[PDB]
Amino acid sequence: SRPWFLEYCKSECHFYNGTQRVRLLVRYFYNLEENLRFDSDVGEFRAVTELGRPDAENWNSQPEFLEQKRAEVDTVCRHNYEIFDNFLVPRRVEPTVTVYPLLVCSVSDFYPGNIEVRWFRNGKEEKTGIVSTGLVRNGDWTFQTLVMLETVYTCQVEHPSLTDPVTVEWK
Amino acid sequence: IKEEHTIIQAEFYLLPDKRGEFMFDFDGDEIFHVDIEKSETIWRLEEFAKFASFEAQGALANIAVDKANLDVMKERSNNTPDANVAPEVTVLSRSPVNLGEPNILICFIDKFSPPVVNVTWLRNGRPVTEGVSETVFLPRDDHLFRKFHYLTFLPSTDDFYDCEVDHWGLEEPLRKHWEF
Amino acid sequence: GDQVEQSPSALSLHEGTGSALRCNFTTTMRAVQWFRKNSRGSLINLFYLASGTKENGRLKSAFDSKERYSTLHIRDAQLEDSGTYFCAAEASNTNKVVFGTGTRLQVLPNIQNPDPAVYQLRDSDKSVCLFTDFDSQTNVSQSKDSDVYITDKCVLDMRSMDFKSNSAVAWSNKSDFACANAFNNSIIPEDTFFPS
Amino acid sequence: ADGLAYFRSSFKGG
Amino acid sequence: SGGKVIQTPRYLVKGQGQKAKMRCIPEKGHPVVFWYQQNKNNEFKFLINFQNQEVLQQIDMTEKRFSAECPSNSPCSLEIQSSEAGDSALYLCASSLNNANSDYTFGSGTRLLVIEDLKNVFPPEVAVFEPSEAEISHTQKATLVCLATGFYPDHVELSWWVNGKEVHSGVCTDPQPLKEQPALNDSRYALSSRLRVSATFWQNPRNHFRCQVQFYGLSENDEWTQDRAKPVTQIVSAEAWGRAD
Ligand SMILES: *[C@@H]1O[C@H](CO)[C@@H](O)[C@H](O)[C@H]1NC(C)=O
Ligand SMILES: *[C@@H]1O[C@H](CO)[C@@H](O)[C@H](O)[C@H]1NC(C)=O
């Protein structure tokens, strides 16, 4: 077949409850295999596969290097969060809810993905016979989803961009 | 009232394709990427550029090191076994489809590796070149990659579209269908 | 113009006192480094800080990534602490190390027993004049007429005997030159001992 | 125009 | 070696248009090398950096005016093709271990001076002055004074040697050598130094004192068509023996 060679590296900044609790997870890949890790919660490099052992031993012998990396939880991660808290984090896009014939609830064009959709027939939440497509990421910072009810009639949509819940109803 | 988020810096260099890629991800979406050849930062939404800056040659420099590292890993690994994870392809519309009302088709290629595919849009079985958009290779939770292809179109009951994706892990080019 | 704000510019410390240096950053730095350049000496590496504080003998260094500063503290100032101090750090949003503007530190010795005196020394037949044993409050001023030379003051340390002394040297070829009128250009201690 | 920070790639070797 | 960076030469004087090559030995095991040019205002000018033999970055000036290489198992080098007055500065070499780090360790640095005329170069006159007898009676201590005069440029390093051993305790050398003639340029320099030891030690005639001055001037390859001796790099000394009462 066709031989290929990949050197892949992801540096993950994890934010639990804003900049209160933050961990850095740097992951080195070779083709299909994760071989090296730097977990800020561990503070040293750790080999995932034998292939990554040399890098791990090499870098862990460098204190001033490790010292810098552990600090990247502040110098890189929280640094960036401060910036992104101005436009990305608070970004809100109001959903567009549509109903058409099984009854479909089409919730489209919204951000963030935090969304709740319920079906009310005669004012009670039909907590059965619900077929959902799940959350769908359009890849352009917009989401969409189809929540369906299998009965032979109004759906409600709650979202962080809505001061008051959005309701639609069918005849 | 708990703000819980993730920021990823994803970068790679690929052989034998001899291309590298550099980008930032926020909670599953691309923030930007850097055109390594052209040396310029490309913000996923144009509106982002009003808030942030990224020094482009920073990304160039990294890829150079990543290039070099690739050689080291190659000589290091006794046997590099070719293996592929085949993509899973999905076609759907960005918005609910209304006749005569302009829209976008999304070709969502997911869960694959290596980061190299051939993707082709098909109006009525014939390739389309106008109104097509593409996204760099996006990161996941795992070792696999993710990609988006977009097509702008006017809905009508006469036209039917297809997205055809070829990847080194597929026996037969995967073709995913969509019509009114 | 594209350097780090380092204060103070200059600093004079009495032997055994202390003070602090401070670098102010215009952005998040990835880590900070501190250097001292001696007298005709090389650049001496003092600290590497990525966070928190580090203390090395009579030196303590601090780095606050968020508050965008770093400080170097000198305590119990000694003679050898004299020199020029630099900070150097690279921004987290670039690839480039940038340096501080620098701090020139002069440490004045404690003269317990001042004995201001001027001696004349013969060639091992030229002759030179030596102002010595004065206290650090005395300033040595340059000789005027172009035929006499006077050097700035200097501190020597006989480590074996725990004794330090200030001293300045003057010399000339002109026949009107005597040690009595050598250091007339300067305001010398009133009780300066003049032999011969 | 606030400048985002990034992780710098380190050469692998010995 | 290490942990130390060896830059040679300590000083260097070249005529306008001549080549100025300077060398640097990075710390043992250190792949990262930087060249900085520091001016009179303590500003650090980036020139070029290497990772081993490969150049990661350099400026337009180093590309056009300088030539540098860091050969395997060989001293790193930076060479100016045609020196001009503007190239007079301190050139610093700093080595690192990890390209993604700070923790530079700087070398001693090479002081380069570029001048129009090399006929202005003079070696230093060295003279040692014996301790005053007044000081011995008054203080029970003995101060020797060394004077180096009439050298140019101000590129010298003074040392005191007692009985064949270099000493540092009780020594004081001027911070900056003074111009022998402040008015006029290309003026020759003067430098003083003192060595104080106890009176009883000076009065032992078996003790040998030597003032040694290293001058950094021309090299053997440089041409010299003047009557006076060729002002090359050389050691100039003056000494004195211990003296009883
Ligand atoms: C999360 O942090 C915020 C402040 O940043 C605080 O008000 C809140 O109580 C925290 N939540 C938890 C579960 O600790
Ligand atoms: C894409 O097509 C070219 C030829 O058109 C082929 O050589 C290459 O292998 C294809 N890529 C994949 C991933 O199959």
mmCIF file of C-alpha atoms in Angstrom, chain A residues 1-19 24 27-35 50-56 59 76-77 80-92 96 98 100 106-109 111-112 114 136-144 146, chain B residues 1-16 24 26-32 43-45 47-49 51-52 66-67 69-70 72-78 80-85 92-96 106 108 113-115 135 138-146 148 150 168:
data_model
loop_
_atom_site.group_PDB
_atom_site.id
_atom_site.type_symbol
_atom_site.label_atom_id
_atom_site.label_comp_id
_atom_site.label_asym_id
_atom_site.label_seq_id
_atom_site.Cartn_x
_atom_site.Cartn_y
_atom_site.Cartn_z
ATOM 1 C CA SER A 1 0.000 0.000 0.000
ATOM 2 C CA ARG A 2 1.055 3.605 0.608
ATOM 3 C CA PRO A 3 3.468 4.247 3.525
ATOM 4 C CA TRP A 4 2.964 7.423 5.577
ATOM 5 C CA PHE A 5 4.641 9.183 8.510
ATOM 6 C CA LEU A 6 3.028 11.584 10.954
ATOM 7 C CA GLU A 7 4.437 13.685 13.797
ATOM 8 C CA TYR A 8 1.361 14.963 15.644
ATOM 9 C CA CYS A 9 1.221 17.064 18.812
ATOM 10 C CA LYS A 10 -1.773 18.386 20.745
ATOM 11 C CA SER A 11 -1.452 20.735 23.697
ATOM 12 C CA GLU A 12 -4.722 20.724 25.595
ATOM 13 C CA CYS A 13 -5.717 23.432 28.059
ATOM 14 C CA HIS A 14 -8.448 22.167 30.357
ATOM 15 C CA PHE A 15 -10.590 24.648 32.224
ATOM 16 C CA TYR A 16 -12.891 23.375 34.949
ATOM 17 C CA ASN A 17 -14.896 26.287 36.347
ATOM 18 C CA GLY A 18 -13.045 29.044 34.483
ATOM 19 C CA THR A 19 -9.476 29.756 35.507
ATOM 20 C CA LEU A 24 -2.385 21.095 30.792
ATOM 21 C CA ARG A 27 0.141 14.655 23.865
ATOM 22 C CA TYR A 28 2.697 13.547 21.298
ATOM 23 C CA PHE A 29 1.631 11.146 18.510
ATOM 24 C CA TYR A 30 3.420 9.071 15.895
ATOM 25 C CA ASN A 31 1.031 8.023 13.152
ATOM 26 C CA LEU A 32 -1.639 6.140 15.074
ATOM 27 C CA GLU A 33 0.064 5.822 18.438
ATOM 28 C CA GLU A 34 0.134 8.269 21.359
ATOM 29 C CA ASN A 35 3.702 7.884 22.610
ATOM 30 C CA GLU A 50 8.274 2.512 24.451
ATOM 31 C CA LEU A 51 8.802 4.734 21.408
ATOM 32 C CA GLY A 52 8.431 7.805 23.610
ATOM 33 C CA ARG A 53 10.752 6.680 26.387
ATOM 34 C CA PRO A 54 13.852 8.479 25.003
ATOM 35 C CA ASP A 55 12.133 11.828 24.757
ATOM 36 C CA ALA A 56 10.715 11.409 28.212
ATOM 37 C CA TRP A 59 13.340 16.124 28.820
ATOM 38 C CA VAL A 76 -0.081 30.021 28.209
ATOM 39 C CA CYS A 77 -3.383 28.512 29.299
ATOM 40 C CA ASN A 80 -5.279 32.773 26.472
ATOM 41 C CA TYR A 81 -8.432 32.216 28.475
ATOM 42 C CA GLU A 82 -8.343 35.867 29.563
ATOM 43 C CA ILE A 83 -8.457 36.828 25.896
ATOM 44 C CA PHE A 84 -11.084 34.309 24.812
ATOM 45 C CA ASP A 85 -13.359 35.293 27.691
ATOM 46 C CA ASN A 86 -14.022 38.504 25.742
ATOM 47 C CA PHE A 87 -15.609 36.984 22.640
ATOM 48 C CA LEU A 88 -15.512 33.178 22.408
ATOM 49 C CA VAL A 89 -16.742 32.143 25.854
ATOM 50 C CA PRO A 90 -19.643 34.636 26.044
ATOM 51 C CA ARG A 91 -20.612 34.048 22.435
ATOM 52 C CA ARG A 92 -24.352 33.607 22.103
ATOM 53 C CA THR A 96 -34.284 29.016 15.115
ATOM 54 C CA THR A 98 -39.289 24.976 13.350
ATOM 55 C CA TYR A 100 -43.089 19.999 10.569
ATOM 56 C CA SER A 106 -35.876 21.504 14.154
ATOM 57 C CA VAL A 107 -33.575 23.596 16.325
ATOM 58 C CA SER A 108 -30.987 25.221 14.101
ATOM 59 C CA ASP A 109 -28.327 27.934 14.084
ATOM 60 C CA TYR A 111 -24.436 28.621 20.081
ATOM 61 C CA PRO A 112 -23.289 27.241 22.465
ATOM 62 C CA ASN A 114 -26.060 23.747 25.737
ATOM 63 C CA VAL A 136 -24.883 18.268 15.399
ATOM 64 C CA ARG A 137 -21.838 20.470 14.906
ATOM 65 C CA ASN A 138 -21.855 22.349 11.600
ATOM 66 C CA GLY A 139 -18.211 23.282 12.074
ATOM 67 C CA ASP A 140 -18.866 26.989 11.657
ATOM 68 C CA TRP A 141 -19.507 27.762 15.328
ATOM 69 C CA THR A 142 -23.191 26.856 14.876
ATOM 70 C CA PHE A 143 -25.161 23.795 16.043
ATOM 71 C CA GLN A 144 -28.362 22.030 15.088
ATOM 72 C CA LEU A 146 -33.798 17.295 15.474
ATOM 73 C CA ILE B 1 -23.151 28.578 36.453
ATOM 74 C CA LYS B 2 -19.981 26.536 35.887
ATOM 75 C CA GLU B 3 -17.843 27.592 32.936
ATOM 76 C CA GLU B 4 -16.126 24.453 31.683
ATOM 77 C CA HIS B 5 -13.976 24.704 28.544
ATOM 78 C CA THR B 6 -11.102 23.315 26.466
ATOM 79 C CA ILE B 7 -8.450 24.969 24.293
ATOM 80 C CA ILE B 8 -6.276 22.861 21.974
ATOM 81 C CA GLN B 9 -3.168 23.703 20.004
ATOM 82 C CA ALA B 10 -2.867 21.049 17.318
ATOM 83 C CA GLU B 11 0.077 20.841 14.911
ATOM 84 C CA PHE B 12 1.552 18.146 12.644
ATOM 85 C CA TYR B 13 3.932 17.383 9.773
ATOM 86 C CA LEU B 14 3.119 14.693 7.224
ATOM 87 C CA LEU B 15 5.144 12.487 4.922
ATOM 88 C CA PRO B 16 5.391 11.821 2.120
ATOM 89 C CA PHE B 24 -6.201 26.398 17.644
ATOM 90 C CA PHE B 26 -12.007 26.036 21.291
ATOM 91 C CA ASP B 27 -14.542 23.536 22.631
ATOM 92 C CA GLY B 28 -14.665 21.628 19.355
ATOM 93 C CA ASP B 29 -14.470 24.492 16.851
ATOM 94 C CA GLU B 30 -11.541 25.969 14.905
ATOM 95 C CA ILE B 31 -10.390 29.357 16.196
ATOM 96 C CA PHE B 32 -7.813 29.840 13.483
ATOM 97 C CA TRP B 43 -9.367 33.185 11.480
ATOM 98 C CA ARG B 44 -12.311 30.748 11.257
ATOM 99 C CA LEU B 45 -14.764 33.612 11.662
ATOM 100 C CA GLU B 47 -14.979 38.654 13.432
ATOM 101 C CA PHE B 48 -12.372 36.907 15.636
ATOM 102 C CA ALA B 49 -9.537 38.983 14.234
ATOM 103 C CA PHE B 51 -10.095 40.539 19.382
ATOM 104 C CA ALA B 52 -6.965 38.462 18.920
ATOM 105 C CA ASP B 66 8.041 19.066 13.893
ATOM 106 C CA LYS B 67 9.474 18.273 10.466
ATOM 107 C CA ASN B 69 11.295 15.497 14.829
ATOM 108 C CA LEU B 70 9.517 13.338 12.279
ATOM 109 C CA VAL B 72 14.005 11.321 14.439
ATOM 110 C CA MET B 73 10.918 9.243 15.118
ATOM 111 C CA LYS B 74 11.296 7.462 11.794
ATOM 112 C CA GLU B 75 14.851 6.383 12.447
ATOM 113 C CA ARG B 76 13.829 5.483 15.997
ATOM 114 C CA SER B 77 10.905 3.176 15.222
ATOM 115 C CA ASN B 78 12.240 -0.205 14.132
ATOM 116 C CA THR B 80 6.678 1.568 10.891
ATOM 117 C CA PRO B 81 3.623 -0.510 9.930
ATOM 118 C CA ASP B 82 1.199 1.120 7.519
ATOM 119 C CA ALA B 83 -2.250 1.188 9.055
ATOM 120 C CA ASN B 84 -5.326 3.227 8.337
ATOM 121 C CA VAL B 85 -8.461 4.220 10.175
ATOM 122 C CA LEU B 92 -26.720 17.088 5.638
ATOM 123 C CA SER B 93 -27.940 20.667 5.293
ATOM 124 C CA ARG B 94 -26.722 23.491 7.503
ATOM 125 C CA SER B 95 -30.246 24.888 7.795
ATOM 126 C CA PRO B 96 -33.721 23.402 7.264
ATOM 127 C CA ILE B 106 -22.195 19.984 4.818
ATOM 128 C CA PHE B 108 -18.732 15.818 7.579
ATOM 129 C CA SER B 113 -6.176 8.838 10.021
ATOM 130 C CA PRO B 114 -3.823 9.708 8.204
ATOM 131 C CA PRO B 115 -4.913 13.302 7.564
ATOM 132 C CA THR B 135 -11.638 23.114 6.541
ATOM 133 C CA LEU B 138 -9.420 19.246 12.858
ATOM 134 C CA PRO B 139 -8.452 17.471 16.158
ATOM 135 C CA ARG B 140 -10.494 15.038 18.283
ATOM 136 C CA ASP B 141 -10.399 13.453 21.765
ATOM 137 C CA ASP B 142 -8.446 10.585 20.232
ATOM 138 C CA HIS B 143 -5.656 10.078 17.698
ATOM 139 C CA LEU B 144 -8.080 10.525 14.789
ATOM 140 C CA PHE B 145 -8.919 13.535 12.588
ATOM 141 C CA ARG B 146 -12.054 15.396 11.537
ATOM 142 C CA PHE B 148 -15.740 19.652 7.011
ATOM 143 C CA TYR B 150 -19.280 22.804 2.407
ATOM 144 C CA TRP B 168 -6.286 5.117 2.134
#
